[PDB]
From TrEMBL:
Transmembrane segments: none annotated. It is found in: Cytoplasm. The chain holds residues 170 to 411 of 748 of the full protein. This is Phosphoenolpyruvate-dependent phosphotransferase system. Component of the phosphoenolpyruvate-dependent nitrogen-metabolic phosphotransferase system (nitrogen-metabolic PTS), that seems to be involved in regulating nitrogen metabolism. Enzyme I-Ntr transfers the phosphoryl group from phosphoenolpyruvate (PEP) to the phosphoryl carrier protein (NPr). Could function in the transcriptional regulation of sigma-54 dependent operons in conjunction with the NPr (PtsO) and EIIA-Ntr (PtsN) proteins. Enzyme I-Ntr is specific for NPr. It comes from the Bacteria. Coiled coil: none annotated. Belongs to the PEP-utilizing enzyme family. It comes from Escherichia coli.
Length: 238
């Protein structure tokens, strides 16, 4: 029973999973390819899958969870389907690069340019571009180190972290340092994922343990089965 902050409503029970590894962007390295036609075909597949993914999310978000995020996800689905973006990626393939490095090269080049701007509303969107790159790399890896169902435990939560996670398996999130008004908190509410924040917690300890995350009341339960069996044997003697 760890008291904590309700960031997104819902209830979930699953094994805790800590991703203490580097993000997908930072573990891509420059790799040579002798098959230019294939790497271009792998890129058009990921761009279309990611654009389709953003297409349904904005279609779903329009009902209830945010109209703002439905609009932002709508614009990014158009950015993902823009041929100028694909030509930027094909230009790196013609240099003899694999699709993963081509995504890392283009995204970081444009994220750097956005971070250098003085316009306030464009400056802060440099992180969104890295998240889109993280999602692009997510669909390249699909040609399963996660549990069947898990609750994400972490010290920080950002858009880049959620972008390298499968939705079907992610049923809850527990953050030790966070702000319930951050961009990541806005996304989990839009996606309907129970989420708790500001929780005195050690992500390295909740790993590989069954957890119950309660986003309505801001409660986290570690190891519910002993507590259940104790109450059950209590009623038997009653």
């Amino acid at each position: 029973r760890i008291r904590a902050l309700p960031a997104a409503p819902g209830v979930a029970i699953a094994e805790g999973w800590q991703d203490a590894t580097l993000p997908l962007m930072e573990q891509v390295y420059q790799a040579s390819t002798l098959d230019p036609a294939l790497e271009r075909e792998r890129l058009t597949g990921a761009l279309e899958e990611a654009a389709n993914e953003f297409r349904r999310y904005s279609k779903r978000f329009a009902a209830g969870a945010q109209k703002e995020t439905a609009a932002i996800f709508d614009l990014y689905s158009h950015l993902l389907s823009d041929t100028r973006l694909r030509r930027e990626l094909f230009a790196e393939v013609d240099k003899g690069s694999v699709a993963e490095w081509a995504v890392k090269t283009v995204i970081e080049k444009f994220a750097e340019q956005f971070a250098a701007l003085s316009d306030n509303y464009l400056k802060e969107r440099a992180g969104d571009l890295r998240a889109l790159g993280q999602r692009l790399l997510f669909h390249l890896d699909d040609a399963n180190a996660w549990p069947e169902r898990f609750i994400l435990v972490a010290d920080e939560l950002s858009a880049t972290t959620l972008a390298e996670l499968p939705q079907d398996r992610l049923v809850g999130v527990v953050v030790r340092d966070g702000a319930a008004n951050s961009q990541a908190a806005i996304m989990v509410r839009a996606l309907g994922i129970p989420t708790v924040m500001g929780a005195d917690i050690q992500p390295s300890v909740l790993h590989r343990r069954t957890l119950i995350v309660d986003g309505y009341r801001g409660e986290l339960l570690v190891d519910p089965e002993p507590v259940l069996l104790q109450e059950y044997q209590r009623l038997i003697s009653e």
